Design a protein around this ligand. Structure first.
Ligand code: ACP
Ligand code: ACP
Ligand code: MG
Ligand code: MG
Lengths: 264, 309
């Protein structure tokens, strides 16, 4: 489970909400990520060991496999490189124009991966379009899932995909299956508007406070005109402020597939 | 004043000799610190020989929007003032936006505050004057707000100078920064948090909240317990709900001037309309009390870090 200096490290790629990733060499094309958390209390390290254990086993075609963790150079995690661009890059940097069937498809495969993860009782906890890659522009690979111990509670990264209860940080643990379902709804918002939520608000603390207290939610009028009605209803169901009202991925997958059948 | 005209001009001349900024022309000297999204380095510009500070922002954004940001930062070339950090240039290269500004060997008041424990009211007087004068210059002559007033945004140097930096000249930059990089605390007015735009009122609140903190050496939301006030956390949603729902911070009873307590109180009232304005603060009694005073701010700063000047 724990490698020891065997690994090679390469070009700096960039840094996210809980680590810095570089292209590496644990074998052909691995992707290694030095975690922000670096002084692990032994109580924290134990939970990390067991979480990596649960993560080693996860194999699914819409999921990027997690290979191991190295502590000795620096506490790092190691995962497969992904030649494709992330979904955030396609939508929001290069503005890839897709047609509705492929957007629905991307939604479907994401839902397949999330349903596999919830089937194995893994809360993603960091679902963003930043963490969905389009492999060779065809398959979907979800990454950066699990690892609850490394993310410590303070928020970090982008607020945009966090549910109200995640933003409040008032429950024992606010992250649940339905938190993932909320994040996934923001990703559906992304797919169906080509746009991030709250494009009209440039005050980050305003967004945090107002979606925290249920005063602000995505503007669903900005969904594009060829968006199926069923898809828009599903989006709205995923984004309910109260977590108990959101659906679980088994019925989300059902919904999306039965939707995708009845297309032109 | 005589001396602002002198020093400002000198900056403009050795800015005239800088020319066009290119990445290969900078050598890294040392690290000045990092924020939520930016990193700052003390660098040497070889063709001119100047030493400056280079902020580097790494954003994942449409190239159209990045070129918009660069165009809008170009406005900094005309925001020249003794209360505004000197600006040399801004450009894009190797995935990074670079903002080149004059180096301030005092650093920010955020760090100074860590090194001094508390900052005396005497010194906060001169600081308040510098910030009010800067916000005023921004508003009167460029119709632009700061939008991010806080001690990490107030820079000082060993020549006694106090200057503002990181003010909102590029809205695209703000809205980019908004889509990532959560922080852990906030200096955001209660009117802005609820989506109200009452202009320059937002920056006055922020300054007030700054003052309290540097006066006591603690970010004042929430107020300290009676046992922790003796010595003279919250996730960010709780902080914001506290700023919105509960009454504003306050200075301690006797340890501070009555005029200073009144100044911060008028800065911190939660109604943006009855809160003090720039022209009112400018003539507040603590402000005149402090402008009459003759302090050795350069020497005080140096004593708080290093050698006297
Ligand atoms: N297995 C992987 N393969 C290729 N690139 C990866 C990768 N994992 C991360 N990256 C890329 O490295 C850069 C930073 O990684 P990181 O995941 O930390 O940022 P991020 O935008 O995904 C926010 P988060 O930390 O919440 O996942 C990103 O550009 C990301 O797309
Ligand atoms: N012209 C300048 N001269 C000297 N030091 C500077 C400087 N500009 C910035 N710095 C230093 O870099 C540090 C970090 O700068 P930056 O503005 O990116 O983050 P910040 O400290 O303002 C917190 P945030 O990112 O939340 O706004 C500042 O505290 C300051 O000490
Ligand atoms: Mg990621
Ligand atoms: Mg700053």
């Amino acid at each position: 489970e724990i490698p020891d200096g065997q690994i090679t490290v390469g070009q700096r790629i960039g840094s996210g909400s809980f680590g810095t990733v570089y292209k590496g060499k644990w074998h052909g094309d691995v992707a290694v990520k030095m975690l922000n958390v670096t002084a692990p209390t032994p109580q924290q390290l134990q939970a990390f060991k067991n979480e990596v254990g649960v993560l080693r086993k996860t194999r699914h075609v819409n999921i990027l496999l997690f290979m191991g963790y190295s502590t000795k150079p620096q506490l790092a995690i190691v995962t497969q490189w992904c030649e494709g661009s992330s979904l955030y890059h396609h939508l929001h940097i290069i503005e890839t124009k897709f047609e509705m069937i492929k957007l629905i498809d991307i939604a479907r495969q994401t839902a397949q991966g999330m349903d596999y993860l919830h089937a194995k009782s893994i809360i993603h906890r960091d679902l963003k379009s930043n963490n969905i890659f389009l492999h060779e522009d065809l398959t979907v690979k979800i990454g950066d899932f699990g690892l609850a111990t490394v993310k410590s509670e303070q928020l970090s990264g982008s607020i945009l995909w966090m549910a109200p209860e995640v933003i409040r940080m008032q429950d024992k643990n606010p992250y649940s299956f339905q938190s993932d379902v909320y994040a996934f709804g923001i990703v559906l918002y992304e797919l169906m508007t080509g746009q991030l939520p709250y494009s009209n608000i440039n005050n980050r603390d305003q967004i945090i406070f107002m979606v925290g207290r249920g005063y602000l939610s995505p503007d669903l009028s900005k969904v594009r005109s060829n968006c199926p009605k069923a898809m828009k209803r599903l989006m709205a169901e995923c984004l309910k402020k109260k977590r108990d009202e959101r659906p679980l991925f088994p019925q989300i997958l059902a919904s999306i597939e039965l939707l995708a059948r009845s297309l032109p | 004043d005589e001396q602002q005209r002198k020093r400002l001009e000198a900056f403009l001349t050795q800015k005239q000799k800088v020319g066009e900024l290119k990445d290969d022309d900078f050598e890294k000297i040392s690290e000045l610190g990092a924020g939520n999204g930016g990193v700052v380095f003390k660098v040497s510009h070889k063709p001119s020989g100047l030493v400056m500070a280079r902020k580097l922002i790494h954003l994942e954004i449409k190239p159209a929007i990045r070129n918009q940001i660069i165009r809008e930062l170009q406005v900094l070339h005309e925001c020249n003032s003794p209360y505004i950090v000197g600006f040399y240039g801004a450009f894009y290269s190797d995935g990074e936006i670079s903002i080149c500004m004059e180096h301030m060997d005092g650093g920010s008041l955020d760090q100074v505050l860590k090194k001094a424990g508390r900052i005396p009211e005497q010194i906060l007087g001169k600081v308040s004057i510098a910030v009010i004068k800067g916000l005023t210059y921004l508003r009167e002559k460029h119709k632009i707000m700061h939008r991010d007033v806080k001690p990490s945004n107030i820079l000082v140097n060993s020549r006694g100078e106090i200057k503002l930096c990181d003010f909102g000249v590029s809205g695209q930059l703000i809205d980019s920064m908004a889509n990532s990089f959560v922080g852990t605390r906030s200096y955001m007015s209660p009117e802005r948090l609820q989506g109200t735009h009452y202009s320059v009122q937002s920056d006055i609140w922020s300054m007030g909240l700054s003052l309290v903190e540097m006066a006591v050496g603690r970010y004042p939301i929430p107020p300290p317990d009676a046992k922790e006030l003796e010595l003279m956390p919250m996730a960010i949603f709780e902080l914001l709900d506290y700023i919105v729902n509960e009454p504003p911070p306050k200075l301690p009873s006797g340890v501070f001037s009555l005029e200073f307590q009144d100044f911060v109180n008028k800065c911190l009232i939660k109604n943006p309309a009855e809160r003090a304005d720039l022209k009112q603060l400018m003539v507040h009694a603590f402000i005149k009390r402090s402008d009459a005073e003759e302090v050795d701010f350069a020497g005080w700063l140096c004593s708080t870090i290093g050698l006297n000047q």
